[PDB]
Write an enzyme that holds these catalytic residues in place. Sequence first.
Site, PDB file in Angstrom:
ATOM      1  N   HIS A  63      52.196  29.686  64.583  1.00  0.00           N
ATOM      2  CA  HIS A  63      51.842  31.165  64.836  1.00  0.00           C
ATOM      3  C   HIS A  63      52.532  31.522  65.701  1.00  0.00           C
ATOM      4  O   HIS A  63      53.004  32.837  65.278  1.00  0.00           O
ATOM      5  CB  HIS A  63      50.647  31.458  65.002  1.00  0.00           C
ATOM      6  CG  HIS A  63      49.893  29.860  66.068  1.00  0.00           C
ATOM      7  ND1 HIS A  63      49.386  29.238  66.752  1.00  0.00           N
ATOM      8  CD2 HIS A  63      50.073  30.854  67.449  1.00  0.00           C
ATOM      9  CE1 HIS A  63      49.651  29.435  68.226  1.00  0.00           C
ATOM     10  NE2 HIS A  63      50.022  30.639  68.171  1.00  0.00           N
ATOM     11  N   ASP A 205      50.396  22.854  63.462  1.00  0.00           N
ATOM     12  CA  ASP A 205      50.746  24.106  64.015  1.00  0.00           C
ATOM     13  C   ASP A 205      51.322  23.798  65.198  1.00  0.00           C
ATOM     14  O   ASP A 205      51.982  24.068  65.827  1.00  0.00           O
ATOM     15  CB  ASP A 205      49.599  24.891  65.130  1.00  0.00           C
ATOM     16  CG  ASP A 205      49.755  26.752  65.416  1.00  0.00           C
ATOM     17  OD1 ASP A 205      50.970  26.953  65.123  1.00  0.00           O
ATOM     18  OD2 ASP A 205      48.750  26.339  65.602  1.00  0.00           O
ATOM     19  N   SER A 630      51.226  29.096  73.957  1.00  0.00           N
ATOM     20  CA  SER A 630      51.448  28.327  72.243  1.00  0.00           C
ATOM     21  C   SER A 630      52.794  27.574  72.470  1.00  0.00           C
ATOM     22  O   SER A 630      53.846  28.199  72.090  1.00  0.00           O
ATOM     23  CB  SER A 630      51.353  29.411  71.497  1.00  0.00           C
ATOM     24  OG  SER A 630      49.999  30.688  71.574  1.00  0.00           O
TER      25      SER A 630
END
EC number: 3.4.14.-
Lengths: 695, 697
Positions: A63, A205, A630
């Site tokens: 992402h 991810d 993240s």
Amino acid sequence: EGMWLMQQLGRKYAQMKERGLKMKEYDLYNPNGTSLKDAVVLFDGGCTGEVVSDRGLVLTNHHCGYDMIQAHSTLEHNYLENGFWAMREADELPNKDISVVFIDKIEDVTDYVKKELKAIKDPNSMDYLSPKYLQKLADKKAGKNFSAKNPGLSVEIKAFYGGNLYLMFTKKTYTDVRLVGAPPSSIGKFGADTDNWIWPRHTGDFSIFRIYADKNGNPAPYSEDNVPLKPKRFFNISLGGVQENDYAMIMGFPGTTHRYFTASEVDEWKSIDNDIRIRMRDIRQGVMLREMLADPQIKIMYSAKYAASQNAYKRAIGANWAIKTRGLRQNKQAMQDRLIAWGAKQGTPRYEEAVHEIDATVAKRADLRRRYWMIEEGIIRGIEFARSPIPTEDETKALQASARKEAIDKIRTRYSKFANKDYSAEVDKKVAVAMLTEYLKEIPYENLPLHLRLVKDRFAGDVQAYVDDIFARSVFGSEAQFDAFAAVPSVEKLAEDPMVLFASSVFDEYRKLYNELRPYDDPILRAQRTYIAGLLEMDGDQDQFPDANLTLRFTYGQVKGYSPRDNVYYGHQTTLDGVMEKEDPDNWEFVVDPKLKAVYERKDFGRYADRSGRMPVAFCATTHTTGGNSGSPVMNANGELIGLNFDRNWEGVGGDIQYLADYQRSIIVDIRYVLLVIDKVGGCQRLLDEMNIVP
Amino acid sequence: DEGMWLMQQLGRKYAQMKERGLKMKEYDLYNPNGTSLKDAVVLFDGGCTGEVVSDRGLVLTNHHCGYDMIQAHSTLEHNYLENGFWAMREADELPNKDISVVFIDKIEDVTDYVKKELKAIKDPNSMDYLSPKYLQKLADKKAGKNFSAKNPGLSVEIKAFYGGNLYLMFTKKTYTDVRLVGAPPSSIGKFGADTDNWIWPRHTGDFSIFRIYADKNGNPAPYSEDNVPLKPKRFFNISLGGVQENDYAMIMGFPGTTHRYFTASEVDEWKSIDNDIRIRMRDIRQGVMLREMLADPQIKIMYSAKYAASQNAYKRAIGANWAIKTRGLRQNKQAMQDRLIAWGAKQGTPRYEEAVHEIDATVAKRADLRRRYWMIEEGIIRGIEFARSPIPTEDETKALQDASARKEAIDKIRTRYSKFANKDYSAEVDKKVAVAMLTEYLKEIPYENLPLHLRLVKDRFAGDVQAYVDDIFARSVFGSEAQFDAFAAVPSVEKLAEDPMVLFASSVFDEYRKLYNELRPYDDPILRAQRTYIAGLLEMDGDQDQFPDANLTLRFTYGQVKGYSPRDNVYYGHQTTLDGVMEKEDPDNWEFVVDPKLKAVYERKDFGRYADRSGRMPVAFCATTHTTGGNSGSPVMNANGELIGLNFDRNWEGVGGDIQYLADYQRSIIVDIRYVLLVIDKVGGCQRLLDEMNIVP
Ligand SMILES: Cc1nc[nH]c1CN1CCc2ccccc2C1
Ligand SMILES: Cc1nc[nH]c1CN1CCc2ccccc2C1
Ligand SMILES: [Cl-]
Ligand SMILES: [Cl-]
Ligand SMILES: [Cl-]
């Protein structure tokens, strides 16, 4: 529990070592040498990343690299859906507007900033938090030609603990960062929106980049002559895996927290911010869902808008669950009462006075803040025709020279952007009727944006008729109505346009509210400086971390699951078997990559499977993370890479105000699953070969 | 696998049960020649199970089992369904009309007797061996001339087991004066309501309390103010010791039906026809209903019960198909039949393989007809409300065509019209449901197989389903109240004979009956081949590790208190607590409202001797016992035979358990007896019920 400054490692080291940390303190963070901190980057201004090879290979989330993968995707080579695997360094794709930032040095400059601040004079000055003022101090300390004398390096001073501590960061920024690898979106975003904030999680991810630089490893913008950066430090990859209770730690850039909120600020966050966002988004999403379910073409056009609205809606539900069930308000109340009792015993009333100023400011702005959130959620983001075209001053002073055509071309460009391939006027009218009905019930006549007074005055309270009239008479109500305007344009027509008047008056009210609310921020900020100073003087800074502010922090904890509710336990680790359980071929979110399904069926896991033959996918830990974390590297007790942080469970969204030991977990993609995907799905052996993999 | 054992099988299972933890003596649990724990078990109201828990005939069963009785005694002045009911004296206990309790007095193996009588075979294909009428003639012959009059309260019944390979005669004692004694509020008795149906973890206090009354000598008697509480032969002691993970648990009760001896072809048929059609058609129906209920609060009120009723078997079919897909049910039946075929070939007896072949061939032959039957039943008979609109009878049409009996025929037609178009019926909702259901039905059933009236969609309305449905309501006598009244003022047989709604209803019911008639002949060859199939399975692997299919007769099952992992990284434990009820509280959602007295008990920790060792209040537990519908209200016993709970549900992951028991997923959902006693005590305040029970520390 905390998001600790690198300076606080010295004071935390003994606690970390008792919890399982095996590496030497200076091997993790060395203030005057090379350390693991030197392999951590701020990726593209928001995410975290990590260097994993002596040739500048970087891992981050899928992402996080999504925009770069999308910008290189075409109908011929759809990297977003198929994944991307550069088979040679020369095939790695450059990215425009990308950056990676290394934190070269960190210095405590509190006494220097506090001495400089003594020259202010105005006691209520906000210079102590001004990025412009702090940059002037950073520049003064570093020197006149610092960046010319030290190419690629820059300085920045930031405030911490509400202005009670200052740090100067020496940063090294690289802007040639190329796309190297990415799994298909079916892996990188497996759960898609359904599994967002969800544990158990089965999403791979990750994405892979490479930092390029000039011949001397110095930062340089994209050039075909650029060579991979040979970094001073990179992470070794561990293939040893994780077990329940293993020590784990993370370094990264958490964005924001509100750990020093008063109980009144928690009540305000619940009763205004969250309740309004929840109520308004539930109305908006309910209408959108009904329309998407009834028409396949409406589903295509509104899917992304629906998903975007759902993100912060889910976050607000998660936050309100913590406020209701985890005693967040009560815990802030106990914290402030304890400081007030201590201040009364020491004979210093300024701490109680500071908490009183925050409560009084919160109480004073309540009606204005409620009006602001109601218009922002209800109309500014709730109704698409609120962002319809509003003629500029130069456009009206052109329609009434033959530059009338130039003005019409600019208005037409904005009309085509508003009424694009994904815009439905019928869907928007339905959404507006439901949103305005709620807004009109909550905001009295005297507080309404000027044009909305016409609902009661002209349309006898009929919201449907008011909305129908806007589209029936507006030059932006349809393509045919715009073209009739464009053939015979007049300023008189635009000045009386019902859609232009609606858009103008709702934006006027939105700005007026913003302007009236802005002055309330400063008394709270100034009182917070005194409040946090008292908390630090009372209990010390060795259990009370500073709020996150997009600066490098470390957090540590253990690989551990949790019980979300009575008789239910979620373990610490998910497996490839869990991806296969979720497979739904006719649901785009849960489609499984054929190469990955084949790997699972043939158990072609090699050295990446655990001791029992099961293939790990993700794990969770009691580390304290938030947005900005993240892509953060997750380390072993030895500092080896065991995973990448990519999410946090919804039960932990309240963790930005109060860490929740029994519920909050960082959601991490297992590094063994990252390597299994690079190897068996991507077939990119050169990436495995350039990494330093420890058995 | 882990099964529903006959009481006769207790002897040969006892050593396995004892090794698993059973502590009680064999004959204290069941003794064919004397009083045992089996005597405290009842078939409650013809469907549920119950248990006697006092020497004054007090009976415990589920709240959903006593729901109709609690509802029949509820008024606006005393709403027992909503607030609970607690009779403070025996004289205050409420009689119930049409209730019964059945005790299983004696059970006797009559296989040799029935098989000898069956030899008087006038046709080898006779289905008398399964006929309730024929078996009743044999039960009456064995019991004697006028057994019922010579033994008031006792009756005799013979049932077939193992597809006609074993027969048992049951001597039953039936009591019909069974009074309502106690019930928690519906917020406790049906806490999860429809949301938590088939769900584990579960937090529902699913219990109700009754009392068996009889004449002065304890003999059955219909309701009389002179009736006295029954002093039973045996009752359960209540345990307050609770349960721990891995504890031995056992149940006795009346499981209704299973299909443990299905061939692999019958599993494929159940999945591909029965389940896939029910899933597809109900998803269409429910989707339309939900959109209309969400858009209009009045439609939600009118259609809530119809929507919930459709959802029950829909959810069951989803659960059943999940087991077929993930638990290898088809493959396991295939291995069972292949093993019998190999053994039959080695014994020199081809009849077993021939029997499996007959079942497969019969299943394959009826496939198109069965698909058409399920399509019309799910799609129209159940799917469209105007399929059950009034159809004028032969005598009603005769009355309309020179006597004062015309008004009588119109009054009867009006009564049926008012029942169809009642306060919960919306013609607009029904037209929307019919358009979606018929669109799917017309796509699946070709023109030549359509019910006669549905041919008009293509022939008269050019394929426009909406126009065909609109025309039915626009022109029908039952399309609106005003259209019916215009008919009732000037009624003619000609009008009724051409009514588009009457013709639709008639032709869809004609096709439904024609399909049923063509499918009925296929049942008997399968039943006869199953008699041979199960005989071979029994001869091959013994009557030791394979139980007979459930058939609403008394069975026992045993296992352990144990949770399970429903999916990757998720574990559901063996026990739920009162803390879980509080977590689920939603004051503005009727399903999850929490009783104020119960919430106060939780806040004050007023749990007494009912809480577990850690001070937590238990609510429910789950066990690896093998149960099905009919086991609602079943007593759950300890290793000592003491009552530890009442079975009330089974998780959706275990619905496949009716074909194949699922050791790692299937669980009986049981209300903890400590939670039952806590509700009676702290919510009902009914101390006399606690005092008449025998509670063991
Ligand atoms: C606490 C709650 N209230 C209504 N629904 C729920 C459960 N929600 C809580 C919020 C949330 C956010 C992201 C993903 C899943 C979930 C689950
Ligand atoms: C296996 C499955 N397929 C579609 N949905 C699901 C999930 N479960 C979970 C919820 C539930 C409850 C009762 C009966 C069936 C089911 C279905
Ligand atoms: Cl470097
Ligand atoms: Cl034979
Ligand atoms: Cl299983």
